[PDB]
Design a protein around this ligand. Structure first.
Ligand SMILES: [Mn+2]
Lengths: 117, 115
């Protein structure tokens, strides 16, 4: 109804998006790999450029990529947290972050289309 | 071979996509109606997030880019500008299916003529 979980796994590790709808607004928690955390927070609306806070620890490539993918479908505000970490991550797994972020975005968008906010 | 033209017509007005291949890259020009123009431009590769520019007084170039993004071997630049004088609501509603129709046409051609 107002909450949903999306997963994807490529190159041998999983990333996950937990979506929460509050009124007309979105909260999306993106984690993955061995040690999930909150490394970056991206805020936006459909009309505004996304801003990112980076906490002390490039997780924002994920939170901002997702934001750009879904910006056109936002009925209100959107907050996206990202914290993916893979131990001894490989170049392949690093390359898989963008396709995986796109995959979660497409599930999210398709969810929003089935569940108009 | 390096250029192709696709058309569609629904609700009594036509849209056309002219495709040009330059190296591995694509230029696609979408026009339609009585007054073709360039009102929005979408750029993308298979692996970047498409970016749309809107010129002042944008769904078509953006919508086509998302349709075809996975089939791209290089860069893609899609211009779009359709205009119908006294456009009707059903003609508005027809722009999306016509965009999809051109997209399926374009995907078919790309697979038959692998860049
Ligand atoms: Mn981090």
């Amino acid at each position: 109804a107002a909450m949903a979980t999306f997963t994807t796994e490529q190159a041998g590790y999983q990333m996950q998006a937990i979506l929460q709808v509050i009124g007309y607004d979105l909260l999306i928690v993106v984690t993955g790999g061995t040690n999930p955390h909150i490394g970056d927070v991206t805020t936006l609306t459909a009309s505004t450029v996304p801003e990112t806070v980076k906490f002390p620890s490039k997780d924002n490539f994920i939170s901002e990529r997702m934001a750009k993918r879904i910006q056109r479908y936002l009925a209100g505000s959107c907050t996206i947290t990202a914290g993916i970490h893979v131990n001894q991550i490989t170049k392949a797994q690093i390359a898989a972050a963008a396709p995986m972020t796109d995959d979660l975005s497409r599930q999210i968008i398709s969810w929003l289309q089935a569940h108009p906010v």
